[PDB]
Amino acid sequence: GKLPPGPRPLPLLGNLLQMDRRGLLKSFLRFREKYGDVFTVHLGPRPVVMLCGVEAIREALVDKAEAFSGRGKIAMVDPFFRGYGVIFANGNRWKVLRRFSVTTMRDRSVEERIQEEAQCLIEELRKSKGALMDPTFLFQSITANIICSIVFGKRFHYQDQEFLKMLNLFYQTFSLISSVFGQLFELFSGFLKHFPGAHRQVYKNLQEINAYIGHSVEKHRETLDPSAPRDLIDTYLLHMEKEKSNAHSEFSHQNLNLNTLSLFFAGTETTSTTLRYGFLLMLKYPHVAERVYREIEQVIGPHRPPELHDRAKMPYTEAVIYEIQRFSDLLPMGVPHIVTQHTSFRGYIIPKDTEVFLILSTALHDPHYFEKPDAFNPDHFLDANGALKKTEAFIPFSLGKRICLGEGIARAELFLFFTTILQNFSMASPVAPEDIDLTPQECGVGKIPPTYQIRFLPRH
Ligand code: HEM
Numbered sequence: 001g002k003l004p005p006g007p008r009p010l011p012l013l014g015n016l017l018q019m020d021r022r023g024l025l026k027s028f029l030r031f032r033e034k035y036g037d038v039f040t041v042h043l044g045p046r047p048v049v050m051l052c053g054v055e056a057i058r059e060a061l062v063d064k065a066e067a068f069s070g071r072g073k074i075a076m077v078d079p080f081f082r083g084y085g086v087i088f089a090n091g092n093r094w095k096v097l098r099r100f101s102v103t104t105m106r107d108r109s110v111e112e113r114i115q116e117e118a119q120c121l122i123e124e125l126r127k128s129k130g131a132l133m134d135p136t137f138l139f140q141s142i143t144a145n146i147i148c149s150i151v152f153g154k155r156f157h158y159q160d161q162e163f164l165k166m167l168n169l170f171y172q173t174f175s176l177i178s179s180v181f182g183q184l185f186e187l188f189s190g191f192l193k194h195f196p197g198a199h200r201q202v203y204k205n206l207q208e209i210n211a212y213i214g215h216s217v218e219k220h221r222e223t224l225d226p227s228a229p230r231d232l233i234d235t236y237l238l239h240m241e242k243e244k245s246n247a248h249s250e251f252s253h254q255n256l257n258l259n260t261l262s263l264f265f266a267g268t269e270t271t272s273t274t275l276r277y278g279f280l281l282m283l284k285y286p287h288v289a290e291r292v293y294r295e296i297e298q299v300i301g302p303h304r305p306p307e308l309h310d311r312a313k314m315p316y317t318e319a320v321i322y323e324i325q326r327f328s329d330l331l332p333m334g335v336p337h338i339v340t341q342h343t344s345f346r347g348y349i350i351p352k353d354t355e356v357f358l359i360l361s362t363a364l365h366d367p368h369y370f371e372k373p374d375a376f377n378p379d380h381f382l383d384a385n386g387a388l389k390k391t392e393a394f395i396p397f398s399l400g401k402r403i404c405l406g407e408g409i410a411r412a413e414l415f416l417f418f419t420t421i422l423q424n425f426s427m428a429s430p431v432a433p434e435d436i437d438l439t440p441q442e443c444g445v446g447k448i449p450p451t452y453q454i455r456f457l458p459r460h
């Protein structure tokens, strides 16, 4: 008849007192035990429908694309993004900005861009003389630069303190959003928005980044050559000029700054966080890293830079990376959707504008597709022959009309960066493999590995 079943809420508090202090995901997994794969949780003042397991998620996002393709808000960042840029946009705005962003994210190839950065990385790693480091900044630098060369038309130097400062702001912002306070804000932002909190810090952090984008936009405006756009910013300026007599053009300055922030954020914090978990995992499972290195020796050798064409011949490294993405579960609850029209779903009726969380973690840890899903195991992506076994449960980019638009770039990045590093270095740290704790630092919107030190030791 009406909504999916779930725990009875209270006025004001919704289902607070039935939640798990450990976080939203935990709370929803305990609801799943009781209600199955489709259920409603009242997050403070409203109902949110949760969909779990790959069948239910694909049925929503793919078979019912017409209904499930809207974007819900993330309360920690809505006040800043306010429905601007491709991530947080709906309706015609989304259509326009998605199309724009997909097209201009192809148009020097992305591969060559990543291969070049990979060489600067190796260089930077050789200069560190196997010193200990927390590699967050470095993994952010390499991925940010890929997006920077596309968006801004250049890369930044690794020791540029201003680049650093922006990366430190993404890092902090993503943690803050994913923190327990940020998960609470999701429930009670109406009330909490009047007090001091991490929500004001996030807001401020994003504004500092946006100010640089502001500047760079103006620099681009002044030096723009309409016959020779240099990058994604130039290209958007030209759409803007072309549509200036339409006051309702989506090619506005607010979309330009926030679409640009969106890309920059997505290109700096996703892949880098996955690599950071990946290198923690190589420290804890040195046998896996050793086996990857053997396949690199055999398929690539020690000198020739890895290339995307190498992937087909390296099923073991590919499986390891799939397993790194599966285990690291970057966005356990994905990004919020909303239904754009009244829909019937498995006998339930989900009114237009109901928020829908698609619990990607549930697909990724599905014990029918992955034997032992809480363990890190590259055999999850291998057949008996040792050939790559892809699976439809593997949905860490989501599915359907909102499927991550950086999937191709992200996978290229993970492959080239992971292989080029292990080609040239092994890893060490002062924590014994058996003592390494993989428990995330935060687990909210983002799952965020703990900080750790690592050394990269040149091979000889
Ligand atoms: C490990 C790498 C990445 C992962 C796991 C990832 C994951 C995701 C997920 C789960 C979504 C939400 C889809 C949904 O609403 O159902 C998403 C959205 C998005 N991602 Fe990624 N992403 C990654 C990297 C990137 C990169 C590198 C970029 C940009 C170059 C990017 C750009 C975007 C954009 C623009 C959206 C919003 C799509 C839309 O609403 O139309 N992502 N990503």
Ligand SMILES: c1ccc(Cc2ccncc2)cc1
Pocket: 074, 077, 265, 266, 267, 269, 270, 335, 404, 445
């Ligand atoms: C809000 C939600 C997600 C993100 C990171 C993100 C972006 C694009 N694709 C994957 C991850 C930042 C802010």
